[PDB]
Ligand binder design. Structure first.
Ligand SMILES: *[C@@H]1O[C@H](CO[C@H]2O[C@@H](C)[C@@H](O)[C@@H](O)[C@@H]2O)[C@@H](O[C@@H]2O[C@H](CO)[C@@H](O)[C@H](O)[C@H]2NC(C)=O)[C@H](O)[C@H]1NC(C)=O
Ligand SMILES: *[C@@H]1O[C@H](CO[C@H]2O[C@@H](C)[C@@H](O)[C@@H](O)[C@@H]2O)[C@@H](O[C@@H]2O[C@H](CO)[C@@H](O)[C@H](O)[C@H]2NC(C)=O)[C@H](O)[C@H]1NC(C)=O
Ligand SMILES: *[C@@H]1O[C@H](CO[C@H]2O[C@@H](C)[C@@H](O)[C@@H](O)[C@@H]2O)[C@@H](O)[C@H](O)[C@H]1NC(C)=O
Ligand SMILES: *[C@@H]1O[C@H](CO)[C@@H](O)[C@H](O)[C@H]1NC(C)=O
Ligand SMILES: *[C@@H]1O[C@H](CO)[C@@H](O)[C@H](O)[C@H]1NC(C)=O
Ligand SMILES: *[C@@H]1O[C@H](CO)[C@@H](O)[C@H](O)[C@H]1NC(C)=O
Ligand SMILES: *[C@@H]1O[C@H](CO)[C@@H](O)[C@H](O)[C@H]1NC(C)=O
Ligand SMILES: *[C@@H]1O[C@H](CO)[C@@H](O)[C@H](O)[C@H]1NC(C)=O
Ligand SMILES: [Cl-]
Ligand SMILES: [Cl-]
Ligand SMILES: [Cl-]
Ligand SMILES: [Cl-]
Ligand SMILES: [Cl-]
Ligand SMILES: [Cl-]
Ligand SMILES: [Cl-]
Ligand SMILES: [Cl-]
Ligand code: NA
Ligand code: NA
Lengths: 526, 175, 175
């Protein structure tokens, strides 16, 4: 029986057998006051003693959020949907620790993605018992509020100041600072890791003065705050808060009255109107996201990055080979998970409209000009491939490269990976390739479990990735030093070296997407 | 190994086996078939070409190194034999430039590029294709050992071709 | 080799044999006796000490490396065993400084120097003997790998101790 005394009370955990060993999991520990009633849309408030043995033996509620009902019954999409009840009372975190209890273990804190509109820490692909077992690190993960409830912003107004879900993540990081030594953890060796919006969140904790001392290093998988979906302008946020108000009959003349009104709405009426706060959306819409609130984020983060105002530490950054494909089946014409999606030039052009709402005509021709000079015009999957690359390069890959470039110019070691392995079990079709989100199960070690029907080459790839992530967290260097592995070079402006992750053998290459990102990065920002 | 390494101590031949048969992993049935081909190619052609280029360039001359990785759409040999010895030649001589010939369009374009690069090398000592936003071909130096890959999709600059293999053939094997 | 390398594939053990028994030349009867001692010393002590020093120094700290080559005039072990493991110790602790003890004069002087060098290292981080026009002890760096020889005649600065041997133990052997 395992009871740990925390600053706020005792917690009981549960033992887990993993790979003939034991991990202790403390699932669903609370880290803030439930943000209900009068606390809705406010910054999370600190938690007071229970006393009391809190039983942390199951995952807690996930935060309220719309769910993906596009493919009912389909594992590829439904695997991302919440797997605990939804509730505004969702501010909990999970701790997994090796057994026997470590002495001063390095801590890995996971921040989930989901567009800032969705996600939960209890997903199966985020289960941190493999990492704790195999690498003897402690893994922590937290639920933070998403959608309007986590990011609604009425700028400067503490009733809805914005970034609440980023302040939830932050209060979780404090909880680790204050409490993790009790579980056997080293609060001085804490690495944040996150994917997509979770990565973008990691990148903003790098810029946030209040997070500076809550962690040591950072890992960004498929995301960074400079991605075009990751920060809402003050203009847009205002328009959106008011549009939500209007749609819920909460329009007022006094803004504090708007918020008061919205605090009376049911979680569901808020969720139902989120999608419409915007005249046209895309499959990549982030209606309620991070904003420059003067608190968490003191200035437009592009200025902070350019001028070197951020936590000085090592970063590990990466992307997958086919980032953009996943999104094309949520609204691009001619695209289906259920056929090979060979689309036409005219369809490609219609797709640009779906993904680039407006976007001058000249803007959209320019994408077309850049991506459709074939070599050569023979290949029927030409336009289908091009639309996926457009969406991935713009939304994920070039913004990750440009973040890494700018961060490293201030003197810190940065490591960049290009993940190019398609899981043998991917439920999505072949044409979608190495999709967004599908490195995650490799990082968390799921392929280490033989009972699971991954290939042997995949077990070995995962084992290597886990070692590299763990050495990065413990030592700031993502090497696998024992098995004559390719040495991972730092990424510098100038050479821009990166490491490819695949089952055959990993290469050092240079200047990923050079020609493409010159387009997105220099020209497109029409 | 006996066919290809006549004699060749037993220890000599075990050493090849040790170097080429640590699989990742022992699952794959084409493991040994692939390994024998690489043994024969690395020993006979690839490492001696790399070592020549390394030693020649150390005396101060520009050298350019390519790794040709396109399998001809018309190869009569079976698939497992891959991008065979002798089969870049028809690309260098331009045969795929002749449309009447049933090479693909991607192959015409690859050949056209290779012909330009060989011709610029001959005329100007520099195997660049300067007009079609092509990958620039870097000189090969001891130290970085940069090379250009030739294939129909897009050509890359890489480094240290067969590094681990050629350390074996080049330093140790000469048992 | 069987006594010292329990198991150790047969190939593992042939490889030691191949590396250590190419004589220059096969004439010398103490050939195999010398080779077994070097195998055991290089594997167990010398190459791992060199590789430690190499890796430690790469992170920016001064490291100093010595090669002790004096056989004590009083060693009770026979001559063929040479400058044995454990037998620098009495020099470091100063026993030869005691004349009543039947060490030679050259050994008193060697010990006095070693004691000074160890003491200056401890007090000041630098194992120099600054007063008697002594050879200056250079730091050991990856790249040059300079070391100081300790013997009664005169000490030298050399480079790359056991280079060929340790490439074997250090890169290849870890069969
Ligand atoms: C700020 O909002 C308006 C959209 O007004 C919205 O009303 C909301 C409650 C919501 O239902 C939403 O769907 C609706 O659009 C944006 O201007 C809109 O542009 C289109 C173009 O025809 C009009 O049809 C909309 O009605 C028009 N607004 C109106 C009704 O006046 C505006 O773009 C947006 N500003 C942004 C984009 O930041
Ligand atoms: C691949 O499928 C797409 C997706 O739309 C279809 O899904 C199919 C599996 C099928 O059940 C079909 O009934 C369903 O609508 C096809 O795109 C569609 O093309 C059809 C053919 O006329 C149009 O009627 C639809 O407007 C269009 N769907 C939309 C709204 O995007 C696509 O044609 C098909 N392409 C192939 C097989 O290459
Ligand atoms: C735990 O170690 C503390 C220092 O941690 C450093 O060492 C590594 C863990 C590294 O990743 C860095 O994060 C840190 O700088 C030390 O101060 C504590 O006293 C230790 N606590 C124990 C053992 O109880
Ligand atoms: C809490 O849960 C544990 C584990 O299932 C159980 O053994 C224990 O009795 C519980 N304590 C109470 C009564 O809350
Ligand atoms: C807006 O209304 C709120 C309701 O409490 C009030 O506190 C605030 O002072 C009002 N300000 C004005 C005059 O707009
Ligand atoms: C190293 O390879 C061995 C087998 O040779 C494998 O069992 C082990 O898991 C590997 N270690 C890492 C961290 O990759
Ligand atoms: C350059 O590309 C053009 C078409 O854009 C092609 O026709 C021509 O043959 C190419 N030139 C070379 C030398 O590759
Ligand atoms: C230096 O040499 C002198 C005699 O010239 C000797 O007596 C003395 O012990 C030496 N000092 C050291 C530290 O070697
Ligand atoms: Cl799964
Ligand atoms: Cl057109
Ligand atoms: Cl074509
Ligand atoms: Cl690329
Ligand atoms: Cl395998
Ligand atoms: Cl290679
Ligand atoms: Cl002789
Ligand atoms: Cl030597
Ligand atoms: Na342009
Ligand atoms: Na060997």
């Amino acid at each position: 029986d395992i009871i740990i005394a925390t600053k706020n009370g005792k917690v009981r955990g549960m033992q887990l057998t993993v790979f003939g060993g034991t991990v202790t999991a403390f699932l669903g520990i609370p880290y803030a006051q439930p943000p209900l009633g009068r606390l809705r849309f406010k910054k999370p408030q600190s938690l007071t003693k229970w006393t009391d043995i809190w039983n942390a033996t199951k995952y807690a509620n996930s935060c309220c959020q719309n769910i993906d009902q596009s493919f009912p019954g389909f594992h590829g999409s439904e695997m991302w949907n919440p797997n605990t009840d939804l509730s505004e009372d969702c501010l909990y975190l999970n701790v997994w620790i090796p057994a026997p209890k470590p002495k001063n273990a390095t801590v890995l804190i996971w921040i989930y993605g989901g567009g800032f509109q969705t996600g939960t820490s209890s997903l199966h692909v985020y289960d941190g018992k493999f990492l704790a077992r195999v690498e003897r690190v402690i893994v922590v993960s937290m639920n933070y509020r998403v959608g309007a409830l986590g990011f609604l912003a009425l700028p400067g107004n503490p009733e809805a100041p914005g970034n609440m879900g980023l302040f939830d993540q932050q209060l979780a990081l404090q909880w680790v600072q204050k409490n993790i030594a009790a579980f056997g953890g080293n609060p001085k060796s804490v690495t944040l890791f996150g994917e997509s919006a979770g990565a973008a969140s990691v990148s903003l904790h790098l810029l946030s003065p209040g997070s500076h001392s809550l962690f040591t290093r950072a890992i960004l998988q498929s995301g960074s705050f400079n991605a075009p979906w990751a920060v809402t302008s003050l203009y847009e946020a205002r328009n959106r808060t008011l549009n939500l108000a209007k749609l819920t009959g909460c329009s007022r003349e006094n803004e504090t009255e708007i918020i008061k009104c919205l605090r009376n709405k049911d979680p569901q009426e808020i969720l139902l109107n989120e999608a419409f706060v915007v005249p046209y959306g895309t499959p990549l819409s982030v209606n309620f996201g991070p904003t420059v609130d003067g608190d968490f984020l003191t200035d437009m983060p592009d200025i902070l990055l350019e001028l070197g105002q951020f936590k000085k530490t090592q970063i590990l950054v990466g992307v997958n080979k086919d980032e953009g494909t996943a999104f094309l089946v949520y609204g691009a014409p001619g695209f289906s998970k259920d056929n090979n999606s060979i689309i036409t030039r005219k369809e490609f052009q219609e797709g640009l409209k779906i993904f680039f709402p407006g976007v001058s005509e000249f803007g959209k021709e320019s994408i077309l000009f850049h991506y459709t000079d074939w070599v050569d015009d023979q290949r029927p999957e030409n336009y289908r491939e091009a639309l996926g690359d457009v969406v991935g390069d713009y939304n994920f890959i070039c913004p990750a490269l440009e973040f890494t470039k700018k961060f490293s110019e201030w003197g810190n070691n940065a490591f960049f990976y290009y993940f190019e392995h398609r899981s043998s079990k991917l439920p999505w079709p072949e044409w979608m390739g190495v999709m967004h989100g599908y490195e995650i199960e490799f990082v968390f070690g799921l392929p280490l479990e033989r009972r699971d029907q991954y290939t042997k080459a995949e077990e070995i790839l995962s084992r290597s990735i886990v070692k590299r992530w763990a050495n990065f967290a413990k030592y700031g260097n993502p090497q696998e030093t024992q098995n004559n592995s390719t040495s991972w070079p730092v990424f510098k402006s100038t050479e821009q070296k990166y490491l490819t992750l695949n089952t055959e053998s990993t290469r050092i290459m240079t200047k990923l997407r050079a020609q493409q990102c010159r387009f997105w990065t220099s020209f497109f920002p029409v």
